């Protein structure tokens, strides 16, 4: 149910904690409608601690794209590295993604590119939110989660 | 000197005014560092008739790049434009090059070899990416934007 899939990707690279509750809260609480500020929002993650800035960034991007009304330290973390590699490829994933129309299909072909290219594909999505329908750019923020959460696994 | 080069480039894309005469004299004004606040100057931008929004774009990102007061959505769409993919593919990639570049005429020189849409996203890379460029530089993509577009009309 579309509110639950983003949900479980995006809350599950958020390292475990307190912090983990608030989020999920504002997260279900936007995905209602209900507290929808968000330069408030925005605020308030700035500040968050155990965050790293990309975590940060997914996560504002997510916000960004769930209210119904842009951030230097959201859009500095998605683009980071401006890899001129990643951008080619965030480019060439970009261009595959305005031809999306789903959920499912747009995190599927997202999954066949790099974490770098996908960083780099939201960041160039953040400045241009409404070029990808919006099943799309959350499967592009799962897909992204998705596999930072293949890399973080012990041995 | 460069902020009367880029002068030049830009009113090129402009057609007589004298709106045009109130565009060259803020431009004027603001190179020669005049009273200028960042917002009511795109405020008064955003609404000026005549001009195409394109135009209203380049000019602000000029603004930008000379005014202080440290975006603005209508900037971000003349320059982004349809966010078109085969123009971003060569815009991204003349970005990256362009951060390499320290003078003006090395800028120009190499955008001017891309094409005009690309130019405009890569400007548009540029307004979002404000920092990551020189002013120099940067200066040199505008006019090498103002050139292709302008050599288009006869």
Known sequence: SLLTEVETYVLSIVPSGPLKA????????????????????????????????????????????????????????????????????????????????????????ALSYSAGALASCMGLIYNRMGAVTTEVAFGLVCATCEQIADSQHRS
């Open 22 to 109: 608030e989020i999920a809260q504002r997260l279900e609480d936007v995905f209602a409608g209900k507290n929808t500020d968000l330069e408030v929002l925005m605020e308030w993650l700035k500040t968050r601690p155990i965050l790293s800035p990309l975590t940060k960034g997914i996560l504002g991007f997510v916000f960004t794209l769930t209210v119904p009304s842009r951030r230097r330290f959201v859009q500095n973390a998605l683009n980071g590295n401006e890899d001129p590699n990643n951008m080619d490829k965030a480019v060439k994933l970009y261009s595959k993604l305005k031809s999306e129309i789903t959920f499912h299909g747009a995190k599927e072909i």
